[PDB]
Write a protein that binds this ligand. Structure first.
Ligand SMILES: Cc1noc(C)c1-c1ccc2c(c1)[C@H](c1ccccc1)N(C)C2=O
Length: 127
């Protein structure tokens, strides 16, 4: 009626596997971002109805969030680390497209992206 359905988090037609990189993505990358002071707005899809943002899902056509990412990791939805890293990048990029520089939500996203890029830089070799 207003919010779209969320991005897919299970589908037996999607190829998937477990890898050491995807396991790092969950144990290190996601859990470090999740517990941060500024994580809360990113922990579930944007609720455009609650927020009175009738333009959000006209502007953001590939929504993403960390709740979605957590479910995709916990359900082993991904084929590789690059797909998961793409989701994080989409989440951050969406935030910056929709909001103004120096908006609180952007400063919050920036703080989390800084941490994300630190953890990604130590993505271990596929083993
Ligand atoms: C993430 C995200 N990308 O664009 C928007 C808009 C959001 C977004 C997602 C959720 C919320 C808020 C904003 C918003 C808010 C405004 C300012 C600072 C912090 C939180 N609030 C009250 C929420 O529960």
């Amino acid at each position: 009626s207003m919010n779209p359905p969320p991005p897919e988090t299970s589908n037996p037609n999607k190829p998937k596997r477990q890898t050491n990189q995807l396991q790092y993505l969950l144990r290190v990358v996601l859990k470090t971002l999740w517990k941060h002071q500024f994580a809360w707005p990113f922990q579930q899809p944007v609720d455009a109805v609650k927020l009175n943002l009738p333009d959000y899902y006209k502007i953001i056509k590939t929504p993403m969030d960390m709740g979605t990412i957590k479910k995709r990791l916990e359900n082993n939805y991904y084929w590789n680390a690059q797909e998961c890293i793409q989701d994080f990048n989409t989440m951050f990029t969406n935030c910056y497209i929709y909001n103004k520089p120096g908006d609180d939500i952007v400063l919050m996203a920036e703080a989390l992206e800084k941490l994300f890029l630190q953890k990604i830089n130590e993505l271990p070799t596929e083993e």
